[PDB]
Amino acid sequence: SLLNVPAGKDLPEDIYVVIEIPANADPIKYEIDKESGALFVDRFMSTAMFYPCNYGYINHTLSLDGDPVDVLVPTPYPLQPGSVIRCRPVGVLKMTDEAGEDAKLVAVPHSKLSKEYDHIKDVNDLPELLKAQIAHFFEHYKDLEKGKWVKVEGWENAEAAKAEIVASFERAKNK
Amino acid sequence: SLLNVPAGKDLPEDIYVVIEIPANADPIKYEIDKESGALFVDRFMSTAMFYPCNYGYINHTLSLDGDPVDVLVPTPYPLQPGSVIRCRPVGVLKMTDEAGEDAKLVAVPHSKLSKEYDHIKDVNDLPELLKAQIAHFFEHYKDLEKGKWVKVEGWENAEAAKAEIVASFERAKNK
Amino acid sequence: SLLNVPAGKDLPEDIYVVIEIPANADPIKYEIDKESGALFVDRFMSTAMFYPCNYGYINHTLSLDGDPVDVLVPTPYPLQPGSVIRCRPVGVLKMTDEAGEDAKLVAVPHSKLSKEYDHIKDVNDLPELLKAQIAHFFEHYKDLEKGKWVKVEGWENAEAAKAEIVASFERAKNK
Amino acid sequence: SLLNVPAGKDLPEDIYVVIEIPANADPIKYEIDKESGALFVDRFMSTAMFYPCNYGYINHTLSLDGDPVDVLVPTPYPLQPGSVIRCRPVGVLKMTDEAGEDAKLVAVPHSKLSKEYDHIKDVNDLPELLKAQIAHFFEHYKDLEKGKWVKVEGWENAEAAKAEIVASFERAKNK
Amino acid sequence: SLLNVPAGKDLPEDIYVVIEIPANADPIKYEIDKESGALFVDRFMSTAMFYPCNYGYINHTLSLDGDPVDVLVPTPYPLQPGSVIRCRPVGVLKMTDEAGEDAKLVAVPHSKLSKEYDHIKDVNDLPELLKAQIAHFFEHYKDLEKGKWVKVEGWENAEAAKAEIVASFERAKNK
Amino acid sequence: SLLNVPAGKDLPEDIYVVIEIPANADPIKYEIDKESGALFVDRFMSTAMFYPCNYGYINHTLSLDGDPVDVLVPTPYPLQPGSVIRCRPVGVLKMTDEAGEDAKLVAVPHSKLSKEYDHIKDVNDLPELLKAQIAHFFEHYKDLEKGKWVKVEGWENAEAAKAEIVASFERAKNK
């Protein structure tokens, strides 16, 4: 099942990301149910926006918020919901919302899948337009949702991203 | 697996529907194989028609025909085959075919997923065009199939729909 | 060509809208070139947003900003860029951008094309979510654009919409 | 513009069909406006059905019902509305609607465009399923439309198809 | 899971093929991970080509190369990745690449799913264009991949295809 | 109509490209008919390949082969056939087909349309993979076509591209 997928071949440099929402899709927020491994409709987004990159999570990880570490993965073509892609972490988007602080990793496809992202080693290697769109999206997609808000803090490097993966992987074993 | 999905959070008012065919899709009739939980191609439809709503079933239910209770779920955008959506039953389409009588439930997305269908509490709240299209579709999609026929009897309210879910849920435990 | 299409069969109640951008499309801002009547790429939008309705204009009209009256037209399925649709105005969204006061009308398909909008006669008849999405889209679509900003002032009625059509049509005759 | 396209390179054997509706498309009935040459939305179909083939007409023809000769053109991939395709007529579907006798030709892409239809020379050469789908589509697409009905009378040959082209072309010159 | 799917109802005449890549899809090479049964991104194809037919494998089979028997299945509409289709083998494409010899089966949908391929009993019944495209695709899709090459040897009949299935099915039990 | 579009706002640095075939589209080779300005189906491609970039031409130019200068335009999203895009030439692909020497320019969207191509000033600036895909596409797209073949000679710079634009534009005035 999707539940038996490893966190990666070699954490934190080489990871697997389970895709829940493809880039440029209809406004349907899917999520893999942790009990069944099936694709559940979380909700229909109320704003006329779409995810700038494919969005998913690393299996076997646990953030302080209680959910697995989520990741944004740009690809040349949108991926299938429920598919798994081998990636390499390059940065992290730090934010704060109504529930506390949050963080989203950005990972690019591994060199075995494509050599198109080999020159991207860190958060500042990503195209500035993409970073602005990802930032803009998170600050506004929940605008029509009563009682919800998001404020982007800033970006952190690949090292901060790797740190988060290792920390959240360990935490998944313990608590 | 898709096989471990509950029938709902609170039957019969709050249910989960496993989607087999999205609304407005190519004429491919998919079905989740009950042995494996995988998406099987049942057949290629012979008529130039498409399902007016997403079509699926409630897991852990058993109709008199021997198959789980099937449901039609309208959404603002077509869903992914194999996805599960939280719904609320609003009516039932009664029919008769070459194998006996049949019935299809109509359920709308739960308020947690969207508030767009909150004003729809019963079968007569559904738009008249949609009801006419659903009716028309079932009476004609199998027209080029030798020895098959369908005759629509009429619609029944939310209470009749809930009754069918409770009855079929119980029946799944017993026989 | 598109330059020869009438403003409507019976202004301001029965109008024709030339569609430039379809609902739920990729972020490509097309525009009909007034000299050639051809579909030109105006720009690639920078935000991850899409038009909640088909977007276009009424031919032979000239609003104060120098361009034809623009309109948003909800349809059950996205239309083709460059197609023309017979509508009935039902409201107007008033805003204030960098230039000054701006207005975007909302028209629904004429009854001869479809019956599902017959009940919508005025702005108050349009679903609240759609109105909120339209407003939110215009407030934020240009966020990542230098020296561009929009502020929404509110919704006005069918009479206010028709007034805009009439004034811009008359203004187009000689001004 | 589309109004200036020839009826064919060598009538009635080699013709040009102006496509108005693509195969397997959303239920939007487009029509080329004869005054402007622009693509107009005729109506939103009420039944959950789609055209089994691309649908259009031969320019410079006038059948008895007042409109150009209409044709269905199967292609391996759906075409663009407003595009023009060189075909070879192979048959005609005869029907009787409310107005009276009606006919819809079937033409296949010319050999210079593709080789996969070379073997189809007459109505008997078209696959049986496709013919059954076309017939079924015309009998039922207007079912949910007031005072509209169609009855299929049968398939006629290539010579009967060409005769219709010729009579309508000649009739168009002066009538 | 996809892992529990049978090789077929009646090998080698009646088989199930698990689909990994749909016909005419974006250049994403997916593969079902044999450990989890999940859809993994194998790689992004570097050439501007697409699979001419849906591509998958027969579960519970083992080729000399160590992987399950792969099959190409033409359908009238592209299938969903991860879906299973009931087929009937009709031929085999023999090839040689940088790793040794290879072979791809061609199977058509079973008559229960569609009667459209009933007249195709063997490799020479397939349309010549399709055979040329399949051949052409395998000889060129890996052209931009350093150190990889493919040379098509030729086609073999249904009997040679059935032989390969039986042999590979047996081999899956033993080694 | 499309026949009245200028070659560019400031040749050869600022040009307009009329798009005939979108990137990543079905294998239908469209062509704008020079007599009517309508989109004609030239042919259905025989190979399972797609154009890696949008493909079109510069109006009012005549290259040596008798046709307008053709160009490939990469965009983040595929464009509509028949649309016009303002570009900036950056290179040319030189080849030798059956007729003789051939050249296909590569132009990127103008900065007023998008900022993501600002850094690309010459052929050396285009990503290597895209250049390899374009070359490979032209070498093989006609493989399954009788008496048709292409051989790639190499990439030339922006100045060489502009020279071709200028010579073909001048040649178009009177030749």
Candidate from E48, E140, E144 with C-beta closest to F50: E48
d(CA C89, CA C109): 9
Contact A44 B76 (CB under 8 A): yes
Contact E44 A109 (CB under 8 A): yes
Give all chains having 3 or more CB-to-CB distances under 8 Å with chain B.
Answer: A, C, D, E
Question: Which chain F positions have a beta carbon within 8 Å of E52's beta carbon?
Answer: 48
Burial group, residue A42, by CB count within 10 angstroms (0-12, 13-18, 19+): middle
Distance from CA of E60 to the nearest CA of A (A): 18
Only one residue has tokens 């020479």, namely: E124
Give all chains having 3 or more CB-to-CB distances under 8 Å with chain A.
Answer: B, C, E, F
Supply the DSSP symbol for A161.
Answer: H
d(CA B28, CA D119): 28
d(CA F49, CA F28): 10
Question: Which chain A positions have a beta carbon within 8 Å of F129's beta carbon?
Answer: 115-116
Question: Which chain E positions have a beta carbon within 8 Å of F24's beta carbon?
Answer: 26
Angle ∠(F32,F36,F41) on CA atoms, nearest 5: 40
Among chain A, residues having any CB pair with chain E shorter than 8 Å are 1-2, 4-5, 18, 75-80, 82-86, 109, 112-114, 116
The first and second tokens of residue F117, run together, are 């191509």
Exp. method: X-ray
CB F155 within 8 A of CB F94: yes
CA atoms within 13 A on the CB side of F172: 18
Contact C28 F79 (CB under 8 A): yes
Resolution (A): 2.2
Search chain C and give the residue with CA nearest A139: C140
d(CA F173, CA F61): 8
Among chain A, residues having any CB pair with chain F shorter than 8 Å are 115-116, 127, 129
CB C93 within 8 A of CB C134: yes
Give all chains having 3 or more CB-to-CB distances under 8 Å with chain D.
Answer: B, C, E, F
CB F30 within 8 A of CB D84: no
Search chain A and give the residue with CA nearest B1: A36
Q: Is C29 annotated as a binding residue?
A: yes
Contact C46 A133 (CB under 8 A): yes
Question: Which chain D positions have a beta carbon within 8 Å of B24's beta carbon?
Answer: 26
Contact E36 A5 (CB under 8 A): yes
**Residues flagged as binding site of B for substrate:** 29, 43, 55, 141
Q: Please tell me the total count of domains within chain A.
A: 1
3-state helix, strand, coil in chain C (%, to 5): 20, 35, 45
The alpha-carbon radius of gyration of chain D (Å, integer) is 15
Q: How far is CA B110 from CA A40, B14, D53, in A?
A: 13, 8, 38
Contact E77 B28 (CB under 8 A): yes
- Helix, strand or coil for residue A3? helix
If DSSP states are collapsed to H, E and C, what string results for chain E?
CHHHCCCCCECCCEEEEEEEECCCCCCEEEEECCCCCCEEEEEECCCCECCCCEEEECCCCCCCCCCCCEEEECCCCCCCCCEEEEEEEEEEEEEEECCEEEEEEEEEECCCCCCCCCCCCCHHHCCHHHHHHHHHHHHHCCCCCCCCCEEEEEEECHHHHHHHHHHHHHHHHHC
Search chain D and give the residue with CA nearest F30: D83
- Helix, strand or coil for residue D127? coil
Give all chains having 3 or more CB-to-CB distances under 8 Å with chain C.
Answer: A, B, D, F
CATH code for the domain in which residue E52 is found: 3.90.80.10
Contact B48 D50 (CB under 8 A): yes
Closest CA to F16 of F81, F74, F88, F76: F88
**Please, do chains F and B touch (3+ CB pairs < 8 Å)?**
no
Distance from CA of B128 to the nearest CA of D (A): 11
d(CA D150, CA E69): 50
Candidate from D116, D127, D129 with C-beta closest to E127: D116
Candidate from E46, E52, E144 with C-beta closest to F48: E52
Question: Which chain D positions have a beta carbon within 8 Å of B136's beta carbon?
Answer: 47-48, 140, 143-144
Q: Is F43 annotated as a binding residue?
A: yes
CB F169 within 8 A of CB F61: yes
As beta bridge partners, residue E15 has: E87
Q: How far is CA B128 from CA B151, B152, C115, D55, in A?
A: 19, 16, 10, 29
Distance from CA of A78 to the nearest CA of B (A): 14
Closest CA to E46 of A71, A88, A109, F142: A109
CB D92 within 8 A of CB D103: yes
Q: How far is CA A169 from CA A139, B18, B126, E123, in A?
A: 27, 32, 48, 52
CB B83 within 8 A of CB A39: yes
Distance from CA of F6 to the nearest CA of C (A): 9
Give all chains having 3 or more CB-to-CB distances under 8 Å with chain F.
Answer: A, C, D, E
Please measure the distance between the N-terminal and C-terminal CA atoms of chain C and give it in whole angstroms: 24
Question: Which chain F positions have a beta carbon within 8 Å of C1's beta carbon?
Answer: 1
How many residues make up chain C in this entry?
A: 175
d(CA D113, CA F28): 10
CB D58 within 8 A of CB D69: yes
Contact E144 F137 (CB under 8 A): no
CB C23 within 8 A of CB C74: yes
CB A156 within 8 A of CB A92: yes
Closest CA to F49 of F135, F129, F153: F135
Amino acid at E4: N
- Helix, strand or coil for residue C136? helix
Q: Is F51 annotated as a binding residue?
A: no
- Interchain CB contacts (distance < 8 Å): A and B: 55
What range defines the domain where residue C160 resides?
1-175
How many residues make up chain F in this entry?
A: 175
Distance from CA of B25 to the nearest CA of C (A): 14
Burial group, residue F35, by CB count within 10 angstroms (0-12, 13-18, 19+): exposed
Among chain C, residues having any CB pair with chain F shorter than 8 Å are 1, 26-28, 30, 33, 35-44, 81-82
Q: At what angle do helices B128-140 and D128-140 cross, to 10 degrees?
A: 150
Search chain C and give the residue with CA nearest F77: C26
Candidate from E133, E143, E144 with C-beta closest to F48: E133
Closest CA to C30 of C15, C20, C38: C20
Q: Is C125 annotated as a binding residue?
A: no
Distance from CA of D164 to the nearest CA of B (A): 26
Q: Is E30 annotated as a binding residue?
A: no
Mutate to test the interface with E, among F45, F133, F139, F149 (most CBs of E within 10 A): F133
Candidate from A82, A84, A113 with C-beta closest to E43: A113
Contact A38 B82 (CB under 8 A): yes
Distance from CA of A18 to the nearest CA of E (A): 9
Contact B27 E77 (CB under 8 A): yes
Main-chain dihedrals φ then ψ at residue C94, nearest 5 degrees:
-95, 135
CA atoms within 13 A on the CB side of C167: 10
Contact C50 A47 (CB under 8 A): no
Distance from CA of D159 to the nearest CA of C (A): 36
Supply the DSSP symbol for B80.
Answer: P
- Do the bridges between strand B28-32 and strand E15-21 make them parallel or antiparallel, or are there none, so unpaired? unpaired
